């Protein structure tokens, strides 16, 4: 008979864990240890100390993460994005646009 007791102590006996393959150099949705986001994951030389899990830029925005399944310190670029603007001559003269 297998018994299970749950108290106020933190649970240290779990089972298998949530994860996927890790894709570099493409725009991707991601989660690292509960840090969710989306962007282009990339390699880095950023020297995280052994206890450090995440990295931040001057304006507090995340710029790097530890892969919990390897030694990899990734750098996270945001999604490539920008305003789209339409160049047009006046419609009275032509319908062409760029």
């Amino acid at each position: 008979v297998l018994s299970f007791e749950l108290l106020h102590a933190p649970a240290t006996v779990c089972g298998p864990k949530k994860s996927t393959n890790l894709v570099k150099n493409k725009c991707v949705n991601f989660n690292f240890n509960g840090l969710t986001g989306t962007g282009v994951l990339t390699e880095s030389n950023k020297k995280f100390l052994p206890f450090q899990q995440f990295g931040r830029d001057i304006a507090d925005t995340t710029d790097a993460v530890r892969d919990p399944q390897t030694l990899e310190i990734l750098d996270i670029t945001p999604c490539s994005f920008g305003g789209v603007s339409v160049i047009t001559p006046g419609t009275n003269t032509s319908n062409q646009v760029a």
Partner: peptide, 22 residues
Amino acid sequence: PDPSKSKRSFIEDLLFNKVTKF
């Protein structure tokens, strides 16, 4: 202008040097 150089003057270069997320 200095033609050998962004073809700025000498004094324009000092001004462009002293003056110093997504």
